[PDB]
A paper describes a structure:
In this study, we identified and characterized a typhoid toxin-like [name] toxin, designated diarizonae toxin (DiaT), as a key virulence factor in Salmonella diarizonae. The DiaT genomic islet encodes two distinct B subunits, [name] and [name], which exhibit unique functional roles. Through genetic and functional analyses, we demonstrate that the heteropentameric assembly of [name] and [name] is essential for cytotoxicity, with our data suggesting [name] facilitates toxin secretion and [name] mediates host cell targeting. The holotoxin consists of a pentameric B subunit arrangement supporting a single PltA subunit, with the amphipathic C-terminal tail of PltA extending into the central pore formed by the B subunits.
To validate the structural insights from the cryo-EM map of the endogenously expressed DiaT holotoxin, we recombinantly expressed [name] homopentameric holotoxin, [name] homopentameric holotoxin, and [name]/[name] heteropentameric holotoxin in E. coli. Cryo-EM analysis resolved these structures at resolutions of 3.05 Å, 2.61 Å, and 2.94 Å, respectively. Additionally, recombinant co-expression of [name], [name], PltA, and CdtB in Escherichia coli similarly demonstrated the presence of the heteropentameric holotoxin (S1G). Notably, the heteropentameric holotoxin purified from E. coli exhibited an identical composition and assembly to the endogenous DiaT holotoxin purified from S. diarizonae. Structural analysis confirmed consistent and distinct amino acid differences that enable the differentiation of [name] and [name] in the endogenous DiaT holotoxin, further reinforcing their reliability as markers for B subunit identification. Three tightly packed [name] subunits were connected with dimeric [name] subunits to form the heteropentamer in the holotoxin structure. The stronger hydrophobic interactions between [name] and PltA, along with additional polar interactions involving [name] and PltA, establish a finely balanced assembly that facilitates the stable accommodation of PltA’s C-terminal tail by the heteropentameric B subunits. Although [name] and [name] can individually form homopentamers, the heteropentamer is preferentially selected by PltA, likely due to its enhanced structural compatibility and complementary interactions. All holotoxins demonstrated cytotoxic activity, but the [name] homopentamer exhibited the highest potency, approximately threefold greater than the [name]/[name] heteropentameric toxin (DiaT) and nearly 75-fold greater than the [name] homopentamer.
Numbering used by the authors:
A (entry chain B): 6 to 230
B (entry chain F), E (entry chain G), G (entry chain C): 1 to 119
C (entry chain A): 5 to 251
D (entry chain E): 1 to 116
F (entry chain D): 1 to 115
The structure:
């Protein structure tokens, strides 16, 4: 899906010059879906997770604007999905064919998050638009603000690559490990510190999002209640 | 009668359940949802409640709870069918709305939503 | 961009006719595993791992007309698919001492061949994946007077307007300590344009601090990538790696 | 008089795409709209009323299993008995079929009663 | 009776359910929740219990059980309605409290929570 | 009756791969097809009915636990009593066994009435 | 009867539910849990059973069963209350325990454990 979205607290002036960068070198697709390699554990994921649904951006913004400890201005960035963007289900199917087990607790967020992961750092030329998200504290509503347009964006025609992520590490045993999540069952890889926030040596000092285990929350909707 | 009357039951599409409340009123078990437009547009809530032991919309209380509890923890696009002027308790009318939660439909983004709709 | 790939130099430093064994053992230990090196910058290689397959696809090439092969060396067995791509130039198949090569994990979208403004010199290969260009080089062991020259030519070749957005890093043996290189870059007023990344410990048994990298500054997150020495394999030598600083 | 009867039809390799809950005359209907996994054919809609139809005792279990197969996105086989609900406005609105069975399905072969 | 009869039912806003307890007393099931301020300030931890076979708030017991559980695992900020002086058992009133869970509301607004409130 | 009488036989180190839900006759039934995690084994099919069998009280708990042990791919030990269902069309289609117990299997010992 | 009678209900703190079993005994659904200290401080694993029909602790069966099934997926540290010598069936005792699960409390920080304690 072309034009995927990412929520970033940095101003457009920073992300239109640097862009989104990889947080490490972990290419495992079993630690990125459960978020143990993104922000809640040994954060070294070799991915930049971006949502394809416009509604997930508002869910992320509402999860950061409702803790009273976060001070900043969030921006939704629209990113043209080139051949380096992969959906998470085609690769999960391949990892299952190779002999790996993704339990329902993870298949039930591969659907919820609508992830389209980028295996390489997002170029500033892929980001087309940045929409400020303003939080009316009295009303408790997040609404779109000034939609700045990048003058660096290169308008080529491309779509997200349909297929398996290359060089995917071999699966592990069925660990049944922690699935880190925040807000309204938003993956921990969508958090602020799931990408390199050290822009030009300077570190963005914002709230560290507290994560909760999602297995109880999914067992709470998948089993009635 | 029926959730999709379209004559008595109104329906707001592409909503997200942002606030959830549970409690008891008059020996029952009521739960209320605050529905706001996904892209911050209408700027006014859609407070809709459902009391377990009162009204003609009572036999579908539990079935409407388990699904609301699903549209709140995930905050997916939802089409809410409500019945207006169902609650008579004036304080309940004041803090909440008169609306009664009647139906919960799943919206597959886009501009279409599964369920009864006006032609 | 340039910080997404795990790059390492791995000069051989010939050990009395151990080229095939050192190639096979060392580079297949290095490339394999979860922490395997994505782009490996082997310089002064010469010979071939004797397991590289033939029938590479045709190359134009671009800019300079010396053919570059694309040996598809499969590290894994028949069941596995761990093939690499060694782009190698048959500049001298009768000497096997200065001949450069680059072994990567995926097929290079582009390849390059650039030489300094001096005619007599022989080009520093370099491949490129998408917007990230990894250039492989070789200097002269008599002090390396052409290091500043090769940085200069790389800059004036990648400053072309249609190639301005491309990020580049340069690695190999420079045969000159980084401090002198940055000193005569500051003399030539090229201070803030290229960064020099080197480990803080000597890279040779003789105490030399060679075998570092020079990276274009305008590349996004260029300060993220830092050159550090690998842990002690104790194989009478070691190569450098350009890792990414933890956020 | 069974999920695997000859009158009951079934569709295979299907995923529950859309969900709906509600009330129809003293009952708590729930409807599911499922489509082929990759994609083909018209979407198939199946409902189940709480206090209407022979399929009354299996309302709660089918509701729970449909929600489980909807949240997970599993490729499943849906059993339907055509022409069960008789109101004609339910029929234009959602469907006339009745959900009678849900089975988790797999790559090529999968679980559940099968017609000869 | 109602959860928002303020003059009688109190409530603590912007709380988080940090500890959960489940058990049985006098032939009736019960659950207790411990809440501390989400803002990080200091206040004596609120303890709210709900017996299923005692008091006038039993019809909502299960409704308040599946919700208090969800607000526990999620750690979401929650307004917690309660009625003071409901439980009489001295061994019970000492380890837990005399408060009774009568309502749970989501306070994901950082200013106020959806539901009844004293004016 | 009990899950560990003797007439009830168990299969250990099995994972629930396939889940089926339906209604047999005035009663809702659910079936599970469990295969060995290590492989090389005949899948075992176990079914339970709400209103038929001596195993009526344990229908809901077994349904919930079979859903839970199917969501997670945890190795389980399935207890079945053969020849509980008599409708030959039902046995031909799914099985003749009766789900009467589910247990979690840590490497080596499983938790349950071993015999 | 209460899960803090102390004069009977004994608790093990900082447990974690490692094994889960479900079955039927004597026309009644039963579930049993095996708890092991999260700090591998050894201790004969604690096995606590619960039968829906038999025993005094019947009304808190589905409330405990759904809390031993939620503290098991989370692997969260947990205090487990049991009533020693409850089950009389010799085949049932010889495989699981005489213990009867009566209370499931959440524990946190390696200190404290919401619930009835004994000083």
């Amino acid at each position: 899906i072309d034009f995927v979205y990412r929520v970033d607290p940095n101003p457009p002036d920073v992300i239109f010059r640097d862009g989104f960068s990889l947080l490490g070198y972990n290419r495992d697709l079993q630690q990125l879906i459960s978020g143990r390699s993104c922000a809640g554990g040994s954060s070294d994921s070799r991915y930049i997770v971006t949502t394809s649904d416009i509604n997930k951006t508002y869910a992320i913004a509402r999860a950061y604007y409702s803790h009273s400890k976060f001070k900043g201005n969030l921006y939704r960035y629209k990113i043209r999905a080139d051949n380096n963007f992969y959906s998470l289900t085609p690769s999960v199917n391949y990892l299952e064919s190779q002999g790996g087990h993704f339990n329902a607790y993870e298949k039930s967020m591969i659907r919820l998050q609508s992830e389209y992961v980028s295996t390489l750092s997002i170029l500033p030329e892929n980001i087309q638009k940045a929409v400020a998200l303003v939080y009316d504290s009295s009303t408790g509503q997040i609404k779109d603000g000034t939609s700045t347009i990048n003058t660096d964006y290169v308008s080529i025609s491309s779509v997200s690559n349909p297929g398996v992520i290359p060089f995917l590490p071999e699966p592990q045993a069925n660990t049944q490990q922690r699935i880190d999540a925040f807000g309204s069952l938003i993956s921990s890889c969508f958090s602020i510190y799931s990408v390199c926030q050290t822009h030009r040596g300077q570190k963005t000092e914002v709230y560290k999002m507290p994560f909760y285990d999602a297995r109880p929350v999914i067992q709470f909707i998948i089993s009635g209640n | 009668e029926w959730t999709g009357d379209y004559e008595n039951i109104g329906y707001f599409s592409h909503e997200v359940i942002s606030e959830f409340h549970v409690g008891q009123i008059d020996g029952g078990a009521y739960f209320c949802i605050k529905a706001v437009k996904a892209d911050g547009s209408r700027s006014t809530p859609l407070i809709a409640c459902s009391v377990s032991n009162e009204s003609v919309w009572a036999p579908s209380f539990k079935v409407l709870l388990e699904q609301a509890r699903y549209f709140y923890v995930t905050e997916q696009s939802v089409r809410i069918y409500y019945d207006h002027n169902v609650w008579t308790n004036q304080p309940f009318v004041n803090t909440f709305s008169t609306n009664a939660l009647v139906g919960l439909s799943s919206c597959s983004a886009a501009t279409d939503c599964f369920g009864p709709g006006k032609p | 961009n340039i910080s997404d790939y795990r790059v390492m130099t791995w000069n051989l430093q010939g050990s009395s006719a151990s080229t095939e064994s050192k190639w096979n053992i060392n580079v297949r230990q290095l490339l394999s595993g979860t922490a395997g090196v994505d782009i490996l910058m082997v310089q002064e290689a010469g010979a071939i791992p004797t397991s590289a397959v033939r029938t590479g696809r045709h190359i134009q090439p671009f800019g300079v007309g010396i053919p570059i092969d694309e040996y598809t060396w499969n590290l894994g067995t028949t069941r596995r698919q761990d093939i690499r791509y060694i782009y190698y130039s048959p500049i001298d198949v009768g000497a096997r001492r200065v001949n450069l090569a680059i072994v990567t994990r995926r097929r290079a979208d582009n390849v390059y061949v650039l030489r300094p403004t001096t005619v007599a010199s022989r080009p520093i290969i370099g491949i490129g994946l998408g917007n990230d260009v990894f250039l492989t080089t070789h200097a002269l062991a008599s002090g390396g007077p052409d290091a500043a020259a090769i940085v200069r030519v790389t800059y004036n070749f990648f400053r072309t307007p249609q190639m301005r957005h491309l990020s580049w890093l340069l690695g190999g043996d420079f045969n000159r300590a980084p401090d002198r290189l940055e000193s005569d870059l500051m003399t030539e007023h090229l201070e803030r344009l290229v960064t020099i990344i080197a480990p803080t410990e000597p890279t040779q048994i003789g105490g030399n601090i060679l075998d570092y990298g020079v990276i274009v500054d305008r590349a996004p997150y260029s300060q993220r990538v830092e050159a550090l020495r690998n842990p002690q394999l104790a194989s009478d030598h070691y190569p450098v790696a350009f890792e990414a600083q933890h956020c | 008089e069974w999920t695997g009867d000859s009158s009951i039809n079934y569709y295979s390799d299907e995923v529950i795409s859309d969900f709906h809950v509600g009330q129809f005359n003293r009952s708590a209907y729930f409807c599911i709209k499922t489509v082929k996994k990759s994609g083909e054919g018209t979407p198939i809609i199946a409902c189940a009323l709480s206090h209407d139809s022979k399929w009354i005792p299996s309302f709660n279990i089918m509701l729970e299993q449909a929600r489980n197969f909807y949240i997970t996105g599993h490729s499943i086989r849906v059993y339907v008995q055509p022409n069960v609900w008789s109101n004609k406005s339910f029929i234009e609105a959602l469907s006339s079929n009745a959900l009678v069975g849900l089975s988790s399905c797999s790559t090529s072969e999968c679980f559940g009663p099968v017609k000869p």
